[PDB]
Amino acid sequence: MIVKTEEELQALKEIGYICAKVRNTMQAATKPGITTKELDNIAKELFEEYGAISAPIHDENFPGQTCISVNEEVAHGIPSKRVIREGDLVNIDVSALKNGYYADTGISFVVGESDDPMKQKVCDVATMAFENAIAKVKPGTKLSNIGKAVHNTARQNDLKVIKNLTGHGVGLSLHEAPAHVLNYFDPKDKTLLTEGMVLAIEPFISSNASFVTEGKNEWAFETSDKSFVAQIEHTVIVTKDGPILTTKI
Numbered sequence: 527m528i529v530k531t532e533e534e535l536q537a538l539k540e541i542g543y544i545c546a547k548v549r550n551t552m553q554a555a556t557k558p559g560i561t562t563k564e565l566d567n568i569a570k571e572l573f574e575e576y577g578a579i580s581a582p583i584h585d586e587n588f589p590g591q592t593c594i595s596v597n598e599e600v601a602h603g604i605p606s607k608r609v610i611r612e613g614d615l616v617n618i619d620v621s622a623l624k625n626g627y628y629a630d631t632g633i634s635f636v637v638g639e640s641d642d643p644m645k646q647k648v649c650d651v652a653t654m655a656f657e658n659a660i661a662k663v664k665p666g667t668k669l670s671n672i673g674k675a676v677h678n679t680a681r682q683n684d685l686k687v688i689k690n691l692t693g694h695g696v697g698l699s700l701h702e703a704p705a706h707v708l709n710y711f712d713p714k715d716k717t718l719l720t721e722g723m724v725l726a727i728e729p730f731i732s733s734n735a736s737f738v739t740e741g742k743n744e745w746a747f748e749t750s751d752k753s754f755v756a757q758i759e760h761t762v763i764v765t766k767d768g769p770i771l772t773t774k775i
């Protein structure tokens with residue numbers, strides 16, 4: 527959406543805080559021996575406490591409060607009896623609405639230690655890619671600068687991006703204009719960012735695969751080659767004085 531009023535701004539900040547709090551609480555609770563359903567139950571309780579509703583449940587009839595994707599799963603994983611293990615690469619993606627307004631945020635991290643440093647590397651590079659993307663965000667700037675920055679960051683680190691997962695506008699719905707915030711540069715795109723525009727920026731950095739495919743069920747996205755993939759996602763408001771992240775707290 528485009529923010530035009532202080533009441534809209536406040537509503538976005540409220541739901542962003544709630545999603546950040548949930549994301550942080552879930553991440554802190556992720557340890558070997560917890561199941562992904564038990565982690566999802568944290569979101570259930572917190573959404574109730576804060577008067578928010580799961581966007582996956584509301585918008586998509588997704589069977590889970592949140593999306594929790596482990597190892598071979600990159601996105602849209604269904605919380606279940608799956609147990610977290612030492613060295614897992616976990617993505618927790620929290621999106622919700624309150625009073626009609628939305629936020630969307632996500633983080634990938636390594637549980638304990640993996641024997642392969644590549645798991646942490648993709649996380650480190652996803653973080654850098656996010657930072658580099660938002661350093662580009664201002665009214666009048668090209669949307670495509672975001673994907674250009676993300677892919678350049680990946681290349682600087684000998685990594686790839688997931689080309690077929692994107693960010694998106696957010697605000698009155700989970701997904702709205704701009705339709706797609708790519709992870710790479712499209713030289714033909716003339717779309718600009720504008721003052722008050724709200725978008726979810728979510729680089730996906732991969733150790734090998736450049737795309738995801740349908741996974742073990744009708745929701746999860748995976749890589750057949752079991753690439754290590756990390757996401758960092760925030761909801762961002764484009765302002766004259768710099769990007770405001772509703773989901774950073």
Ligand SMILES: CSCC[C@H](N)C(O)(O)c1ccccn1
Pocket residue numbers: 581582583585586588593601602619620621630631632691692700726728759
């Ligand atoms: C209601 S379904 C949840 C969608 C998710 N929060 C996402 O928009 O960030 C996303 C994640 C992965 C790929 C694309 N989009």
Ligand SMILES: [Co+2]
Pocket residue numbers: 619620621630631632759
């Ligand atoms: Co998300």
Ligand SMILES: [Co+2]
Pocket residue numbers: 692694701
């Ligand atoms: Co999405």
Ligand SMILES: [Co+2]
Pocket residue numbers: 630631693694726728759
């Ligand atoms: Co998103």
